Amino acid sequence: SSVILTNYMDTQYYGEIGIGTPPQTFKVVFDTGSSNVWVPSSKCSRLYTACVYHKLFDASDSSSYKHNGTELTLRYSTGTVSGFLSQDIITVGGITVTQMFGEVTEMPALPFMLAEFDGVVGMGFIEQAIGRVTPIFDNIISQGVLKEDVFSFYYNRDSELGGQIVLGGSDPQHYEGNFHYINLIKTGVWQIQMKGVSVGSSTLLCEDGCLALVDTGASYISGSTSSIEKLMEALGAKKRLFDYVVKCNEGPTLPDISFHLGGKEYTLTSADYVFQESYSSKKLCTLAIHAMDIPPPTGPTWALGATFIRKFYTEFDRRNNRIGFALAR
C-alpha cells in the first residue's frame, strides 16, 4: 500500500488519512521522529486561530468513535500541541486500522497557522510514544497483511507527484542502484551512527563520530548549535533568527556537504541544500540546513530531514532494526 504525498514549498510533505464513520479527511505529515497520531479537534476553542484554519475532527459525527479522554501533550522541536486521546477507525493508503489518537484542543498560532497540514502521524517506535499509545504502524503490522515490516519514503523536488510513502516495502520506480543499510543504534528510535561530516575539503565536523536521527518530519538537515556554527562559518553564511542565509549570487559556489553513514558517503551539492530563489548579490537565499538542539535521551544529534531524503530514497526496516538508503530517482 502506498500513500500519495503533496509537496508544499519543499518544507511540508503530507498525505491524507480518513478518521471515523463516515470518514473525516485530514492532511497529515508522516514523521519518523515521533510516535503519536493527532489531528485538530472540534472541541478546540476557536480562540486558537490555527483551529479556525484547519480541518477539525468531530467525534459526534462518527459512529465508530470510542471515548477515552486521557489528557496528552505533544512537544515537538518547533512547537507544542495538547488535547486528549480518542479511538476510531483510521484509513491510511487503503488499509483500515482501529487507532488511538490525539484530539488536539490547544494549537498555537505560531507555528500552526503556517502549517498546510492538519495533523501528524507518528511513524516512530512505541518506546517514544507519549502516553504509551500503540503507534499506527504497530497496529497495521498486527493485522499481518503487509508483505514486509518496513515502510519507505520518497520526497520529490518542489516542482509544480509531491512524494510517496509505501507501507510494506519500497517502490523501485523512485530509486536506483541498491540499498545500503545502517543498523539502528537501538530499537525504539530511528537513529543511526554517523561516522563523520565533511564540508568541501576538510572533514572538520562530527570527528570521532556522532548521531543521526533519520527524520521524515523534519524539513531540514539539522545539527547542534556548535556543529552548525562551524559548518556555516565554513560556508560563509550569515546567521539570522530562524535560519542561515548566503548572498544568492554565491549559492551555486557553495561546497559539497557529505555525510558518512555506514561506510558510504552521502553527498549533497549546493543545489541540493540552498533555496536558490535568484542569483542577485543584493538578495539573500536561505539554506536547507538549520541548527536544532534536540534534548536527551534522543539528542544531542543531527537530524536528516527532507533536504536529505529528497536526494536519497529511504527505507525504514522494522524487522531488522535498520535503515536503508538508495539514490532517489
Task: Verify that 94 and 161 share a domain, yes or no.
Answer: yes
Distance CA 14, CA 69 (A): 27
H-run or E-run covering 139: helix 136-141
Task: Verify that 159 and 189 share a domain, yes or no.
Answer: no
Q: Which of 135, 170, 205 is the last residue of a domain?
A: 170
- The strand pair at 119-122 and 24-31 is best described as parallel
Instruction: Decide: 14 and 39 in contact? Cβ < 8 Å.
Output: no
H-run or E-run covering 179: strand 175-183
Distance CA 58, CA 72 (A): 18
Three-state SS across 279-321?
CCCCCEEEECEEECCCCCCCCCCEEECHHHHCCEEEEEECCCC
Task: Verify that 198 and 140 share a domain, yes or no.
Answer: no
Task: Verify that 192 and 284 share a domain, yes or no.
Answer: yes
Instruction: Decide: 44 and 108 in contact? Cβ < 8 Å.
Output: no
Instruction: Decide: 213 and 304 in contact? Cβ < 8 Å.
Output: yes
Task: Verify that 38 and 166 share a domain, yes or no.
Answer: yes
Specify burial of residue 294 (Cβ count, 10 A radius: 0-12, 13-18, 19+).
buried
Task: Verify that 79 and 101 share a domain, yes or no.
Answer: yes
Reply yes or no: is the peptide bond before residue 252 cis, omega within 30 of 0.
no
- The strand pair at 302-304 and 210-214 is best described as parallel
Give one word for 167, left, alpha or beta, with left for phi > 0 and alpha for psi -120 to 50: beta
Question: What's the domain count of the chain?
Answer: 2
Strands laid side by side in the 264-268 sheet:
196-199, 257-261, 264-268
Judged by DSSP in three states, 54 sits in coil
The domain spanning residue 11 has which CATH number? 2.40.70.10
Find cell 540552498 and name the residue.
Answer: 274
Distance CA 288, CA 297 (A): 25
Find cell 542577485 and name the residue.
Answer: 280
Active-site residue flag, 215: yes
Among candidate residues 134, 168, 173, 128, the one with its CA nearest the CA of residue 152: 168
Distance CA 104, CA 7 (A): 24
Instruction: Decide: 306 and 169 in contact? Cβ < 8 Å.
Output: no
| Cβ neighbours of residue 270 closer than 8 Å, sequence gap 6 or more | 251, 252, 253, 254, 255, 256
Method: X-ray
Instruction: Decide: 192 and 260 in contact? Cβ < 8 Å.
Output: no
Task: Verify that 117 and 219 share a domain, yes or no.
Answer: no
Residue type, 328: A
Task: Verify that 190 and 92 share a domain, yes or no.
Answer: no
Judged by DSSP in three states, 322 sits in strand
Using CA atoms in the order 243, 114, 84, 37, what is the torsion angle rounded to 10 degrees?
-70
Q: Which of 122, 140, 170 is the last residue of a domain?
A: 170
Task: Verify that 157 and 16 share a domain, yes or no.
Answer: yes
Q: Which of 136, 170, 204 is the last residue of a domain?
A: 170
Specify burial of residue 284 (Cβ count, 10 A radius: 0-12, 13-18, 19+).
middle
Task: Verify that 6 and 103 share a domain, yes or no.
Answer: yes
Task: Verify that 293 and 192 share a domain, yes or no.
Answer: yes
Q: Which residue range forms the structural domain that includes residue 61? A: 1-170
Task: List b or e across 114-143, with b for residues whose CB sees 16 or more CB atoms inside 10 angstroms.
Answer: ebebbbbbbbbbeebbbeebbbbbbbbbee
**Choice among 10, 118, 215, 317 that is catalytic:** 215
Distance CA 236, CA 250 (A): 9
**Choice among 31, 88, 118, 317 that is catalytic:** 31
Task: Verify that 154 and 128 share a domain, yes or no.
Answer: yes
DSSP string, 148-176: SSEEEEEE--S----EEEEESS--GGGEE
How many angstroms is the resolution?
Answer: 2.2
Q: Is the dihedral of CA 128, 260, 161, 149 positive or negative?
A: negative
